[PDB]
Write a protein that holds these residues in place. Structure first.
Motif, PDB file in Angstrom:
ATOM      1  N   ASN A 158     -12.836  -4.160  -1.432  1.00  0.00           N
ATOM      2  CA  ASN A 158     -13.153  -2.847  -0.898  1.00  0.00           C
ATOM      3  C   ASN A 158     -12.951  -1.733  -1.933  1.00  0.00           C
ATOM      4  N   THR A 159     -13.464  -0.546  -1.615  1.00  0.00           N
ATOM      5  CA  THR A 159     -13.148   0.690  -2.337  1.00  0.00           C
ATOM      6  C   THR A 159     -12.742   1.770  -1.330  1.00  0.00           C
ATOM      7  N   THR A 160     -12.131   2.851  -1.806  1.00  0.00           N
ATOM      8  CA  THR A 160     -11.627   3.891  -0.901  1.00  0.00           C
ATOM      9  C   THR A 160     -12.030   5.297  -1.328  1.00  0.00           C
TER      10      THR A 160
ATOM     11  N   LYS B 174       4.793  11.759  -0.475  1.00  0.00           N
ATOM     12  CA  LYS B 174       4.006  10.563  -0.819  1.00  0.00           C
ATOM     13  C   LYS B 174       4.887   9.463  -1.383  1.00  0.00           C
TER      14      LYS B 174
ATOM     15  N   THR C 130       4.418   5.893  -3.464  1.00  0.00           N
ATOM     16  CA  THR C 130       3.449   5.058  -4.175  1.00  0.00           C
ATOM     17  C   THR C 130       4.150   3.948  -4.946  1.00  0.00           C
TER      18      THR C 130
ATOM     19  N   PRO D 264       0.803  -1.228   0.000  1.00  0.00           N
ATOM     20  CA  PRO D 264       0.000   0.000   0.000  1.00  0.00           C
ATOM     21  C   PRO D 264       0.836   1.278   0.000  1.00  0.00           C
ATOM     22  N   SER D 265       0.234   2.378  -0.437  1.00  0.00           N
ATOM     23  CA  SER D 265       0.927   3.664  -0.465  1.00  0.00           C
ATOM     24  C   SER D 265       1.113   4.226   0.943  1.00  0.00           C
TER      25      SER D 265
ATOM     26  N   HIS E 114      -8.790  -0.596   2.375  1.00  0.00           N
ATOM     27  CA  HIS E 114      -8.010  -1.613   1.672  1.00  0.00           C
ATOM     28  C   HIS E 114      -8.725  -2.979   1.607  1.00  0.00           C
TER      29      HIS E 114
ATOM     30  N   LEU F 221      -1.645   5.885   3.482  1.00  0.00           N
ATOM     31  CA  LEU F 221      -2.295   6.987   2.786  1.00  0.00           C
ATOM     32  C   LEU F 221      -3.802   6.771   2.624  1.00  0.00           C
ATOM     33  N   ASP F 222      -4.203   5.609   2.111  1.00  0.00           N
ATOM     34  CA  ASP F 222      -5.619   5.330   1.869  1.00  0.00           C
ATOM     35  C   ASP F 222      -6.318   4.796   3.115  1.00  0.00           C
ATOM     36  N   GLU F 223      -7.601   5.112   3.265  1.00  0.00           N
ATOM     37  CA  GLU F 223      -8.342   4.632   4.423  1.00  0.00           C
ATOM     38  C   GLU F 223      -8.929   3.245   4.195  1.00  0.00           C
TER      39      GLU F 223
END
Ligand SMILES: [Cu+2]
Length: 153
Positions: free
Chosen positions: A151-153, A22, A24, A3-4, A147, A143-145
């Protein structure tokens, strides 16, 4: 795929430096690094910045991050990028400079893979004045909520 990650710099009484770095996952087994900073202090740059080995505590004391992340015992000055400490982003890629700084590059030594010895998740980044003084620092977090493969974010 790993993950980022992001390091969010916030302004305080100690420092006007704010913005993000960041991380990535990219092609060819490297990590894309995106730096976007402002509020860098007048005339005490250029600014080395590195991944350090301990988190920034709640006190925001950048000294508490201790030393550089250096699992492969690299060196501060080198003639090829891979000879640098994994955490030595500035030595490999250039110091931060100016009042504002935006850059993008690939680093092939840091890892977003938590099973890797070069993993930088849970660590921190410190930005220094040219004389080494620690100016501001931030934790490296997810970074993303959202996973997971359903799923979607
Ligand atoms: Cu440092």
């Amino acid at each position: 795929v790993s993950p980022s990650l992001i390091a969010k710099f916030e302004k305080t009484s100690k420092s006007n430096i704010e913005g993000t770095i960041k991380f990535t996952p990219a092609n060819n087994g490297t990590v894309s690094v995106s730096v976007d900073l402002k509020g860098l202090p007048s005339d005490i740059g250029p600014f080395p910045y590195h991944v350090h080995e301990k988190p920034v505590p709640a006190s925001k004391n950048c000294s508490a991050t201790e030393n550089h992340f250096n699992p492969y015992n690299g060196t501060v000055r080198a003639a090829t990028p891979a000879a640098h400490e994994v955490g030595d982003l500035a030595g490999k890629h250039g110091n931060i400079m100016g009042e504002s700084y935006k850059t993008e590059y690939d680093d092939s030594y840091i890892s977003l893979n938590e099973k890797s010895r070069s993993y930088i998740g849970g660590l921190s980044i410190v930005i220094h004045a040219n004389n080494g003084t620690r100016l501001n620092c931030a934790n490296i977090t997810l970074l993303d909520e959202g996973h997971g493969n359903a799923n979607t974010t």
